[PDB]
Design a protein around this ligand. Sequence first.
Ligand SMILES: NC(=O)c1ccc[n+]([C@@H]2O[C@H](COP(=O)([O-])OP(=O)(O)OC[C@H]3O[C@@H](n4cnc5c(N)ncnc54)[C@H](OP(=O)(O)O)[C@@H]3O)[C@@H](O)[C@H]2O)c1
Ligand SMILES: NC(=O)c1ccc[n+]([C@@H]2O[C@H](COP(=O)([O-])OP(=O)(O)OC[C@H]3O[C@@H](n4cnc5c(N)ncnc54)[C@H](OP(=O)(O)O)[C@@H]3O)[C@@H](O)[C@H]2O)c1
Ligand SMILES: O=C(O)CCC(=O)C(=O)O
Ligand SMILES: O=C(O)CCC(=O)C(=O)O
Ligand SMILES: [Ca+2]
Ligand SMILES: [Ca+2]
Lengths: 413, 412
Amino acid sequence: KKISGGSVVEMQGDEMTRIIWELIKEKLIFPYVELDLHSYDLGIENRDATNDQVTKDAAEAIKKHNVGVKCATITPDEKRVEEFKLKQMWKSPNGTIRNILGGTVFREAIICKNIPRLVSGWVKPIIIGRHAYGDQDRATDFVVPGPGKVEITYTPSDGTQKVTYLVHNFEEGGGVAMGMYNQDKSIEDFAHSSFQMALSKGWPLYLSTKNTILKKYDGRFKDIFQEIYDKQYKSQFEAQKIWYEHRLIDDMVAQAMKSEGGFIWACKNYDGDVQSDSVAQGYGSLGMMTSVLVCPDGKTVEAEAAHGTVTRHYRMYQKGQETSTNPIASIFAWTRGLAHRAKLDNNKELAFFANALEEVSIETIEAGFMTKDLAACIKGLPNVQRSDYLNTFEFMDKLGENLKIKLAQAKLS
Amino acid sequence: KKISGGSVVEMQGDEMTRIIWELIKEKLIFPYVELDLHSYDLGIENRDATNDQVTKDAAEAIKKHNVGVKCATITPDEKRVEEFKLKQMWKSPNGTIRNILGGTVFREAIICKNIPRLVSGWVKPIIIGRHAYGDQDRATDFVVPGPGKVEITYTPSDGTQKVTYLVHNFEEGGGVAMGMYNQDKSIEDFAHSSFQMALSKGWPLYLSTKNTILKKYDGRFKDIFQEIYDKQYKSQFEAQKIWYEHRLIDDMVAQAMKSEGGFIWACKNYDGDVQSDSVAQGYGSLGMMTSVLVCPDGKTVEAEAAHGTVTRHYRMYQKGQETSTNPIASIFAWTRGLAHRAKLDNNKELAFFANALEEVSIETIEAGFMTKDLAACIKGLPNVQRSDYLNTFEFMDKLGENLKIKLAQAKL
Ligand SMILES: NC(=O)c1ccc[n+]([C@@H]2O[C@H](COP(=O)([O-])OP(=O)(O)OC[C@H]3O[C@@H](n4cnc5c(N)ncnc54)[C@H](OP(=O)(O)O)[C@@H]3O)[C@@H](O)[C@H]2O)c1
Ligand SMILES: NC(=O)c1ccc[n+]([C@@H]2O[C@H](COP(=O)([O-])OP(=O)(O)OC[C@H]3O[C@@H](n4cnc5c(N)ncnc54)[C@H](OP(=O)(O)O)[C@@H]3O)[C@@H](O)[C@H]2O)c1
Ligand SMILES: O=C(O)CCC(=O)C(=O)O
Ligand SMILES: O=C(O)CCC(=O)C(=O)O
Ligand SMILES: [Ca+2]
Ligand SMILES: [Ca+2]
């Protein structure tokens, strides 16, 4: 428990990830690391008991301590309300945290050499900038009960005017309606973060919109990205022999699918949410991806796993059946969190520990110890046997040995 | 001595697609088929001159004649406004036409046994039912100039009282804001058509939504599907050993990517638009996909090609250089329409011809004659020799020649 890590905000999750989260702290972290740990329990029961307040407290605690790591959480619908006897259908804690902090969420696969892909031609990593603010996460949606008029209006703060837009007039029957929004300054921050990540990896930058369909809404993103690139980034982009280009999401997803990778993909909030699942599965597992929210201050960071609570695996866990569930994405939330913490504190010891754990996971997988998903990439699902993989505990305990070995060997040098 | 086809509505496109469209008419359709043809030119320059009225006329024609076929068109942005010197930025004819007719757009890849997929496991078709109505096509978006309150309001027709919801309060600077909607009845028709397609093809049906995030908007789609499923189609699904399941869009796309295919995928408007282009490309080309708008009446269809105008190739075609562009989607637009035109009139010849032009198009590619896109699928693009592919004109000729042979052989 020797390395002094400093202050880190921990957010505990639900279901299968919450079990993995506890195995991670016990086996891979607390033995080697002493942290000043501000822990917020985001499990569904404690959010219900606090009326979601713990979610907001955790977000403000991240603002203060500059780093947080988040386990995956249940976002309840009607069935979850009935399952846990909830008071309300609470909003996504991810959406709540992301809209307080702001910024961009970068998502990238975690690449092992022995792991085949689903998409043949990606030999270089694709990196998704996902705008983290506004759009669907922040939307206001409601059921339209019957005939009537749906309008969306804008009143300036002074208000010396009112601009009223017709959304729809429902002549017979009901339906649904929603408003949504984004902010210029958040878009600008989203652009600056996308361009800088391009130059940081030396790669070109594709931004995708619908702007032919939404002309004002998506046109604003295209305009903001083009103005900033023209004025600020263009000379720098040319000198590295890369470029920035806008593409319609239709073409963009087709291009991304047939390309070789090796590009930064700046997506709007909804697209990045959906495409990072497709991308991560293309490289062969949702268990292998990193998701790191980088805030506009260049200082505060929130790392997480981008996949969910793996309910189906949890259900087998509750019956005593063996599970094989991929912890790697969760482990990398900690390593991405501890590495940014070392950067802020100039802690070489912690920075070394974070990198070593990432290598141990990849080495352990490249050396043939893996969960069932990754073995299914190798053999195909119908060909995998029980002897072909390790259960969730066997795999954590294996990484435990290899992490002890790697840190022991390093102590002699 | 031509087959009499009946009445078809034609909508003509722009750029590269408009060239291929004219090729298919002269070399493929016209010699063998006589048609009562109502031609509406949807080219961007005409839409400007008719103030887009040409597009509403074409849709009403589709209601009247039940059959239409469409070449891809330009939906202008500010750049296109400069290029064509447009009066306004016209909305998408595809959205305009879809929102008049209503329905589910059904999309599926065209499979030639010799063409490798980018995605390893899909050995069976993925058919995406795409809701054609509302959502992003009908949205009202505007620029927020500066600080202030954006609100969404519902005023009932019975005069009870107004509900006003706060969208956002901008306390510094501006942004963008938009409203959007959908209609219960349209969702019900989208549900019914998805359950029927799953039963006729015998495959499981998945619906994908965001319902954990939009709890009302997407919760409605999910409630309606589940209601109609249990009360109407449930016991027929169980009789065919297939199921209906709702999935979060996140989980769904990963489930589709790692599956072997063989399912019906019900998507909301935007999702169906994008996922259909990722799915076509996973099968190896945007050039082979069928897109049919199937209207709720069980009668009218509009057949199109889901891809765009292929502008990049059009710029090369304008340079006189060799363009290889895959006609297949535009051809299958005509055949899917004509097969429907034949199903209505019980015209057995036009039905034989429609399957012939599809059977020919697949055999020409499975014999080694293909456009560059499909050649890159086999050898990879850096390995593609000029000897591997025929250009746009060369390819449409090999089809017309194999078409002449296949129809000549069955006259007997
Ligand atoms: N970041 C977040 O906090 C976040 C994000 C998404 C979803 N969620 C929540 O998670 C809950 C469940 O959502 P969901 O069932 O739609 O999606 P999910 O549980 O995340 O994933 C569904 C399927 O994806 C596969 N999978 C995902 N991660 C895996 C891993 N690490 N190792 C092995 N397999 C993995 C499993 O495949 P197989 O079934 O094929 O074995 C799993 O059954 C919901 O309450 C949702 O709100 C939270
Ligand atoms: N149905 C419609 O009316 C429809 C649908 C979508 C877009 N559009 C319109 O089309 C215009 C341009 O769209 P866009 O530039 O975004 O994309 P696009 O025209 O659809 O095509 C862009 C890329 O897709 C590939 N591609 C698509 N179809 C192909 C084919 N048949 N054969 C060979 N390659 C093909 C090409 O890839 P490579 O460059 O790599 O060779 C091409 O550069 C826009 O104005 C848009 O509004 C119309
Ligand atoms: O918070 C949720 O409910 C979904 C979050 C998610 O899917 C993501 O982070 O990509
Ligand atoms: O009409 C447009 O502008 C795009 C249409 C499209 O890409 C589609 O519906 O597949
Ligand atoms: Ca996601
Ligand atoms: Ca499309």
